[PDB]
Design an enzyme around this catalytic site. Sequence first.
Site, mmCIF file in Angstrom:
data_model
loop_
_atom_site.group_PDB
_atom_site.id
_atom_site.type_symbol
_atom_site.label_atom_id
_atom_site.label_comp_id
_atom_site.label_asym_id
_atom_site.label_seq_id
_atom_site.Cartn_x
_atom_site.Cartn_y
_atom_site.Cartn_z
ATOM 1 N N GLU A 1 13.032 47.657 52.851
ATOM 2 C CA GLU A 1 13.214 46.463 52.046
ATOM 3 C C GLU A 1 14.444 45.705 52.532
ATOM 4 O O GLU A 1 15.396 46.296 53.054
ATOM 5 C CB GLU A 1 13.308 46.793 50.550
ATOM 6 C CG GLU A 1 14.608 47.428 50.095
ATOM 7 C CD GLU A 1 14.577 47.828 48.634
ATOM 8 O OE1 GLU A 1 13.473 48.008 48.091
ATOM 9 O OE2 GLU A 1 15.651 47.975 48.019
ATOM 10 N N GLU B 1 5.443 36.169 62.904
ATOM 11 C CA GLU B 1 6.539 35.671 62.110
ATOM 12 C C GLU B 1 6.442 36.055 60.642
ATOM 13 O O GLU B 1 5.403 35.881 60.014
ATOM 14 C CB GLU B 1 6.589 34.160 62.239
ATOM 15 C CG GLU B 1 7.690 33.503 61.444
ATOM 16 C CD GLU B 1 7.699 32.006 61.617
ATOM 17 O OE1 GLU B 1 6.698 31.459 62.131
ATOM 18 O OE2 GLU B 1 8.707 31.379 61.245
ATOM 19 N N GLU C 1 11.798 30.542 52.659
ATOM 20 C CA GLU C 1 11.772 29.138 53.062
ATOM 21 C C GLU C 1 11.957 28.427 51.735
ATOM 22 O O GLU C 1 11.081 28.493 50.871
ATOM 23 C CB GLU C 1 10.440 28.761 53.699
ATOM 24 C CG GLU C 1 10.293 29.307 55.101
ATOM 25 C CD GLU C 1 9.139 28.697 55.833
ATOM 26 O OE1 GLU C 1 7.986 29.089 55.564
ATOM 27 O OE2 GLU C 1 9.388 27.818 56.680
#
EC number: 3.2.1.91
Length: 434
Positions: A126, A212, A217
């Site tokens: 994580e 990716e 974002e």
Amino acid sequence: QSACTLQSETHPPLTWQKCSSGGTCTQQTGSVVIDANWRWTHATNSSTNCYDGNTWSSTLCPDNETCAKNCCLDGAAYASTYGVTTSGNSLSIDFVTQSAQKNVGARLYLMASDTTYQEFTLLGNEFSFDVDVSQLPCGLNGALYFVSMDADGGVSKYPTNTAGAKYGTGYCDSQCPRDLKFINGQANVEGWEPSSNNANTGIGGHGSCCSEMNIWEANSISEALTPHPCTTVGQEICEGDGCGGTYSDNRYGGTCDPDGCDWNPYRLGNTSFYGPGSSFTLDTTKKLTVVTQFETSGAINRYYVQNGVTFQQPNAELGSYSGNELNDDYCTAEEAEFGGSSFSDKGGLTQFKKATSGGMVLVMSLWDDYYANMLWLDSTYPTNETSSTPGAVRGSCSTSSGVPAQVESQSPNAKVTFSNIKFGPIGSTGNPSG
Ligand SMILES: *[C@@H]1O[C@H](CO)[C@@H](O)[C@H](O)[C@H]1NC(C)=O
Ligand SMILES: [Ca+2]
Ligand SMILES: [Ca+2]
């Protein structure tokens, strides 16, 4: 490209934490390097620019090979030229910095040493980080993600590239970017097309593809989590429109999935979860913690922490799917309800597991969108669509927001701050930092 030393290259330091299943976290010391595209590219034997504005020197760079042999990348003044600064475990990026020239944003990589990138194996682990997006309005994107780049920046595969990781070479992502000046130890001068809306960029005849993982974002209005698989996991050059992605004509003709299986709480229906102010669950005017877990099944989980209160990714109902975990069922339902087949055509989460099972480089950036004004992140998109169209609304920003020239002149002081990065096995990053 080779490296020149007219300007010294000093990577700003950045510490992060590595945690273990035994319950302890230890401080690691790293540094950040700016991407090669932002650097001064000039003749190896003089200060003559090989690239200026949005055009290459036709004498120094008549073709890809000659250009790479004649040109080198130089050092970067992080603070004064790029507005990039670090303090302990904190990293800040200013939107617009005015020096001898105007600089907009930056793309940085975490390094393991002065000459190599730090690689992370996400599967079964994580990643946690704190972020302050309060100074990011509509049209901006403060991103933190992972890409399958080589640790040496590609030096071992392409001999003509001697600058390496130290100079931020080797970038690649799911959109197979054709705006890169140097790819595979060569220049991208062949087939170059200057941008009609950006005086500092262009599109070359080749792109650089790779898996990716867009962990983050976002701006103060919207945020999205998005995995992008590719038929070829690692970095691979592509040619022309065969690249697909944003920069090419046929978007889905390439080896990578440019769309991804995205998860935007607002887009999925919860419009009160993330936003600026106390009327939102997560107040973006204040710092927050974002934790992302990559379980062995290939699914992705996410929870947030603000002011000591924990919030799991909000529940969403899409078609026959219901839950808060990004898994096969969610991605399948999304394509069914919102449309598309790119993610599944590229192998989905199973193919993506191949990327997370290997090493990936950490990227942190701040950018504005010259192609779609970031409408795909924080507004209605396409702009002709309505709210009755499934998945059209992704944020509350006006469909007229995000004009680069406008946000750059109206919000030059915008910036993003990433801090307290922690990495370790699932369930370990919440433990005491060392
Ligand atoms: C949005 O998510 C938050 C946190 O999970 C929850 O408390 C709230 O009820 C949700 N609101 C809606 C409209 O789904
Ligand atoms: Ca990308
Ligand atoms: Ca699960």
